[PDB]
Design a protein around this ligand. Structure first.
Ligand SMILES: CCCCCCCCCCO[C@@H]1O[C@H](CO)[C@@H](O[C@H]2O[C@H](CO)[C@@H](O)[C@H](O)[C@H]2O)[C@H](O)[C@H]1O
Ligand SMILES: CCCCCCCCCCCCP(C)(C)=O
Ligand SMILES: N=C(N)Nc1ccccc1
Lengths: 104, 87, 104, 90
C-alpha cells in the first residue's frame, strides 16, 4: 500500500512542478498556492510511504515520477520542445538521478 | 487590479478596496504606495497578500491631498491603479 | 543566467537536505534555520528559473544537481561507499545536465 | 544534562521573577524552550509558556508574594538533557 502513496507522493511532485511554472515566478495566486500545498502533500505522502519502504527505492521512484512527469506535462501543457536530442539527454539525466538515489 | 475605491476614511486614515479579478488574475501580493499629491519627498509603501482585496492607510495628515497606487507583482497583468484623495 | 540560478538552487537543495538530518525533530536552532533558509533560497531561485526555462528541464536539472551534490558530499564528508556503479550514475547525470544546457 | 544549563533568577519581585539559563554552544541551541511554573505544592495545575530558542532569559509575572514556586525549563525533546528546575520564594 505504502508503494501507491509513494506513486501519489510522486504525482503531487509533478503537480507543484506544473503549478510553479503557471505561477510566473510565484506571482499568480492559485498556481502559487497549488505549488506550496502540492509540495507538503508530496513530502508528507513520501515520509509515510518511506516509513514502510526502503529510503533508496522510495526516493528513486518518488523523484523519477517527479522528473519524468515534469518533462512530459511540460512538452504537453507548455508545448516545451520534443527534440531527438533533448529526449536523450533527459533520459541520461533521469537515469543518473534514479541511479544515484537507488545506490544511497 | 481595477476598482480602487476609498470604502471609508477618517482625517488620519483611509480604507481602500480593489477588484482582484477572478481566479486566473489573482496575484500573490499587491504593493500599495501613498504620498502627498504635492511636495511628496518619498512615498510610504507596503504590501498586502493577494488574497486580500482591501487595505488600510494610517498616519495621514488631515486635510492633505494624498495619492494612493496599487501595484501587481509585475507589469504583465493590467497596469498600476492610482487615485487622489484629500483626508 | 537562468541556468546559473538553477545550479545554486540545486546547491541549496542539498545544504538543507543534509542540514535537516543535522537538525533533530526540527529542534536544533542552527540546523533548523539553515534548512529553513536553504529551502526558501532553493524554492525561490527555482521559481525564478522556471520563468525562462521549460519546467521539465528546470525540475530534472535542479533535482540532478541536488542528487549529485548529495553523493559528492556523501562520499567526501561521510566516508560513503564509492562504487563503479555510483561513478557511472554521476557521469550519466553530468552528461544529462551538460547535454540539456547545450540544446538551449 | 546538556541543555539548558545554570537556571537562576536574575531579578525578582514579590509578583514577578526574571529567570536566565546558558543555552549552551551554537550546536546545542534549540528552536525553543518551554517554561513551567507553579506553587511548589500544586493547589490545582501548573502555569506554562514557551520562548524562542534564541532567548536565554524569560520573565514570569502574576505570582502570589511570599509563596515558594518551582520553575522548570525544558528543551524541545528529551534527546538534549533532563529539564533543569529551581525553587524560589517571592
Ligand atoms: C528512465 C527509466 O529508468 C530506468 O527504468 C527501469 C524501470 O523498470 C529501472 O530498472 C528496474 O527494473 C528491473 C527489472 O527489469 C529491476 O531488476 C531493477 O532492479 C529495477 O531498478 C532502471 O533502474 C531505471 O534506471
Ligand atoms: C515561498 C518562497 C518563495 C518566495 C518568493 C516570493 C514571490 C515574489 C517574487 C517577486 C520578486 C522578484 P520580481 C519583482 C522580478 O517578480
Ligand atoms: N520537494 C522537493 N522536491 N524539494 C524542495 C526543496 C527545498 C524546498 C522545498 C522543496
Amino acid at each position: 500500500m505504502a508503494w501507491l502513496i509513494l506513486i501519489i507522493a510522486g504525482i503531487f511532485e509533478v503537480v507543484w512542478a506544473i503549478a510553479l511554472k503557471y505561477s510566473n515566478g510565484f506571482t499568480r495566486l492559485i498556481p502559487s498556492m497549488i505549488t506550496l500545498i502540492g509540495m507538503l502533500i508530496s513530502f508528507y505522502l513520501l515520509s509515510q510511504a518511506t516509513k514502510t519502504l526502503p529510503i533508496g527505492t522510495a526516493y528513486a521512484i518518488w523523484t523519477g515520477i517527479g522528473a519524468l512527469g515534469a518533462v512530459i506535462c511540460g512538452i504537453i501543457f507548455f508545448k516545451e520542445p520534443l527534440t531527438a536530442l533533448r529526449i536523450v539527454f533527459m533520459i541520461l539525466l533521469l537515469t543518473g538521478i534514479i541511479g544515484l538515489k537507488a545506490t544511497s | 487590479p481595477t476598482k480602487l475605491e476609498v470604502v471609508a476614511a477618517t482625517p488620519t486614515s483611509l480604507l481602500i478596496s480593489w477588484d482582484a479579478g477572478h481566479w486566473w488574475e489573482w496575484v500573490t501580493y499587491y504593493r500599495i504606495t501613498y504620498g502627498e499629491t504635492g511636495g511628496n519627498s518619498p512615498v510610504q509603501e507596503f504590501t498586502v497578500p493577494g488574497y486580500s482585496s482591501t487595505a488600510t492607510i494610517s498616519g495621514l495628515k488631515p486635510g492633505v491631498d494624498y495619492t494612493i497606487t496599487v501595484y501587481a507583482p509585475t507589469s504583465d497583468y493590467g497596469s498600476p491603479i492610482s487615485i487622489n484623495y484629500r483626508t
